[PDB]
């Protein structure tokens, strides 16, 4: 705290701080003189979920139409890692069925399978005070 | 258990196991988190990845309802001898 904002002024030194529990942080650390900006990396919205899916499902080999919108509707509450898991689990269903490609059905199971796994997760909505 | 394993046969008596054998819980704060880890380590030694050895443990408590379900499981506490009031 004395180095971010103390007697000696910090010049040309920038600090990026990351945490999923900003509620537990000290008020002095969260003070605007030290952490001026509190950038909220929130859970992806409908468009944000769609963008992340194409990022991770890009290198996936697939034939047939892939309805990314259908995945997005069932992806509500997912994070970026969950959408990558949907791509991973979709291929896992292809490998399980001895396929060299992933179809929309495989994606349909994967997004549903990950959705069941989200029931084990506790409260995530934590914000700085 | 490391010192118990340095012997061919051993007996460990845990009198009043309920002091550390209480069931795990989450009360928001760190309620009994450290003591639960002690029970978790004891549970790990009784039945974990590594074989326990030739140790036969003996636990005594007057409050068995408070014990953790994993500690009250066969492989850690196989026999549950009840000392009921004499007839």
């Amino acid at each position: 705290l004395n180095q971010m904002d103390g007697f000696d002024t910090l010049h040309r030194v920038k600090m990026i701080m990351a945490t999923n529990r900003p509620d537990t942080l000290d008020p002095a650390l969260l003070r605007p003189g030290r952490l001026d900006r509190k950038i909220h990396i929130d859970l992806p919205n409908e468009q944000a979920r769609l963008d992340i899916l194409k990022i991770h499902a890009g290198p996936i080999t697939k034939h047939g139409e892939i309805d990314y919108e259908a995945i997005v509707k069932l992806s509500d509450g997912f994070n970026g890692a969950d959408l990558r898991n949907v791509c991973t689990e979709a291929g896992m269903f292809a490998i399980r069925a001895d396929h060299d490609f992933v179809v929309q059905e495989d994606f349909m199971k994967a997004v549903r399978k990950v959705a069941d796994s989200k029931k084990l997760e506790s409260k995530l909505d934590y914000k700085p005070v | 258990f490391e010192m118990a394993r340095t012997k061919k046969a051993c007996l460990i008596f845990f009198d009043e196991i309920d002091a550390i054998g209480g069931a795990r819980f989450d009360d928001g704060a760190g309620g009994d988190n450290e003591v639960q880890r002690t029970m978790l380590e004891l549970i790990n030694q009784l039945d974990g990845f590594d074989p326990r050895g030739n140790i036969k443990v003996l636990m005594a408590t007057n409050r068995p309802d408070t014990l953790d379900p994993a500690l009250m499981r066969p492989g850690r506490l196989d026999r549950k001898i009840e000392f009921s009031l004499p007839d």
């Binding site: 919205n45 409908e46 468009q47 259908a70 509707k73 069932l74 509500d76 509450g77 | -």
Partner: protein, 242 residues
Amino acid sequence: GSSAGFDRHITIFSPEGRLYQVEYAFKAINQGGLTSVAVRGKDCAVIVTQKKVPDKLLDSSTVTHLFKITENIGCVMTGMTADSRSQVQRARYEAANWKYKYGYEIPVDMLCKRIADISQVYTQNAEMRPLGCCMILIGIDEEQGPQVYKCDPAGYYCGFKATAAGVKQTESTSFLEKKVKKKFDWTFEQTVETAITCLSTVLSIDFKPSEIEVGVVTVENPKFRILTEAEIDAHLVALAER
């Protein structure tokens, strides 16, 4: 945040004078993950909420948070779906009883003032929990004009020029506060536009004519109607072109 006894399990006061159970009912409104926005204009009131249909298996014609309490009064429900229907059914019964007992349509202000009275009992008696839902009635009064009233689980109620309930209530409130500061008596088209924009800007969705529901009441026709997808598309097209 001190506690003493069952102050977190039943509706009894905390040592600092707080009803945690009632407060927890407010966090229950956000469990549905939907945001509703209501805006009142010079001669109309508009309620706008997002409708989420996760799968094509669901009949989208049934997933509606817009309810016609009576002909001249409509509401949008936010929170638990099961608790929302009970409040709507309770509100319909009180509206019908008011019509039978008093001979005229129940005013919008008195409709939740009754509903807030029912929900206040839940916050005082300990054998039942508060209803985790938020009610926003909109209707055209005979003299006062368009009216908007939010009706919270705590039994609080107040009139609003433009209000919002749900996960993004405070994000949408700041947006509506800015628009109201400009002091424009919006027409019917503008109220729908600012209500759709408020939900669009806060959520950043760029709504399609299947993802929100719009319910309007106007002075010319003091009846509550749900905007169809064709009607809702006209406003979205107008939003895009400007």
